[PDB]
């Protein structure tokens, strides 16, 4: 009954914001999201299903992550339009629904629910932001069509629109493919990745924080629900990691570089999909979400519109703690010890090798080493001599947020035997 909280706050604030100063609405939306997360903790080990709607360990972990991302992204945004909060609220529920069901059609409706309000969140209205928004909507609705014909073909090979239905030969194979298309696009796996560079660079940074954390989370959550075969998995991984890192090399811009990098990262997480461990994947995404949320909070404190790579430089001198935190984020996203990113990566790699897929694992790993070029090209870039750069040094809100996130990262780098004990049933 986190869903209850979500629907309630969204619907209520809709009309309330007519009577409230936009700030009052910000206070409100913030409050709501945090409360939903609270209900998530109080339900740990209490898994609950109602309709096609189902809350279990997975739903719990992945919406814990998603809710976290939504709170952080609302923290930064001070625009005096109450809707620029409202849309976030909507989107959040949408992602929760996406992670919370096996029903293909409810999954579809949930997809529209989460995806439509982000299209509107893509507008600072800076000339790029309309281009970004456009590409996003067109490619998005296309994928909508695909996941829908996929649900229709799943209902095709078998009596149900609910996943887990017994399944045929080639038609079933086809149907699982058509579900895999949309669900894959939403996660930025190659070669579905083309939007990712454009939209991250085009959309206002804090929004991108929201996307690059919450969306990827929810998407992998729904992905685990699908039955996907080893060969396809191999393909997606290979392409994601290769093109992701290689093209990320070519990147002169922080956001875009981060996009390609995130393509590679979706590539890494997709290995957990081999066994679908989800204690492992849950962990990986915990670490990743923390680090990335951090990274984009910092990219927000630089500029909302665009951040080049040099802008990151000299950040240590300016603010020591933010320099350090960004560094840590770069390392956790690199998957280097002793950071939680290493245990997430390791857990995915472990499930991968456990599944006995070797060449794939290897390639993923090799080009994962490729990623260190740009990961240090940022993390170390922190220490160079500061060039002329925009800097607005945050509220306590942001400083304490970013640092907290980093600390949570490295804490679980050393003691995953804290949370990992229950990313499972919740003991």
């Amino acid at each position: 009954m986190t869903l209850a909280i979500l629907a309630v706050f969204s619907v209520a604030l809709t009309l309330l914001g007519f009577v409230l100063p936009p700030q009052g609405v910000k206070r409100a939306t913030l409050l709501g999201l945090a409360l939903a997360l609270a209900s998530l903790l109080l339900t740990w080990g209490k898994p609950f299903a109602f309709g096609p709607y189902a809350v279990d360990g997975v739903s719990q972990v992945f919406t814990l992550l998603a809710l976290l991302g939504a709170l952080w992204t609302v923290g930064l945004v001070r625009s005096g339009r109450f809707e620029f909060y409202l849309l976030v609220l909507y989107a959040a529920l949408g992602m929760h629904l996406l992670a919370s069901t096996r029903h293909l059609l409810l999954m579809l409706v949930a997809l529209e629910a989460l995806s439509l309000p982000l299209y509107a969140l893509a507008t600072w209205r800076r000339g790029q932001g309309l281009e970004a928004a456009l590409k996003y909507f067109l490619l998005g609705a296309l994928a909508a069509a695909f996941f829908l014909y996929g649900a229709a073909l799943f209902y095709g090979a078998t009596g149900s629109l609910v996943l887990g239905a017994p399944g045929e030969g080639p038609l079933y194979a086809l149907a699982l493919g058509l579900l895999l298309v949309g669900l894959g696009f939403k996660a930025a796996l190659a070669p579905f990745h083309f939007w990712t560079p454009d939209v991250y660079q085009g959309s206002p940074t804090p929004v991108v924080l929201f996307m690059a954390t919450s969306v990827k989370a929810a998407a992998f959550a729904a992905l685990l629900r699908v039955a996907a075969p080893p060969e396809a998995l191999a393909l997606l991984v290979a392409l994601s990691v290769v093109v992701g890192n290689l093209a990320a090399l070519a990147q002169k811009e922080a956001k875009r570089l981060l996009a390609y990098s995130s393509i590679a990262h979706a590539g890494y997480m997709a290995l957990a999909l081999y066994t679908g461990n989800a204690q492992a994947l849950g962990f990986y995404l915990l670490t990743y979400v923390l680090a990335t949320g951090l990274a984009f909070a910092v990219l927000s404190q630089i500029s909302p519109d665009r951040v080049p790579l040099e802008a990151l430089r000299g950040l240590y001198r300016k603010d020591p703690l933010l320099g350090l935190a960004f560094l840590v984020a770069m390392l956790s996203l690199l998957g280097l010890p002793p950071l939680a990113g290493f245990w997430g990566k390791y857990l995915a790699f472990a499930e991968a090798a456990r599944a006995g897929a070797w060449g794939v694992l290897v390639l993923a790993l090799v080009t994962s080493a490729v990623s260190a070029y740009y990961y240090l090209g940022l993390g170390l870039a922190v220490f160079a001599r500061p060039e002329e750069t925009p800097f607005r040094p945050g509220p306590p809100w942001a400083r304490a947020a970013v640092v907290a996130a980093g600390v949570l990262l490295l804490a679980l780098g050393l003691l995953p035997g804290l949370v990992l004990p229950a990313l499972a049933a919740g003991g």
Binding site: L249, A250, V370
Partner: protein
């Protein structure tokens, strides 16, 4: 002689670094920015996957 050989070795490794960089920006050149381009590359990729599945 062996020294200069070794230097040249190091330089060749730099060669690989640049090969991966290059390949990378070929892959980064893969994205032009025209939407029709992204759409065609999209359908292309998807057909590639469904092909892989049998």
């Amino acid at each position: 002689a062996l020294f200069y050989g070794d230097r040249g070795l190091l330089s060749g490794y730099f060669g690989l670094g640049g090969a991966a960089r290059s390949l990378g920006q070929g892959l980064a050149r893969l994205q032009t920015g025209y939407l029709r381009v992204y759409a065609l590359l999209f359908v292309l990729g998807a057909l590639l996957l469904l092909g892989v599945m049998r």
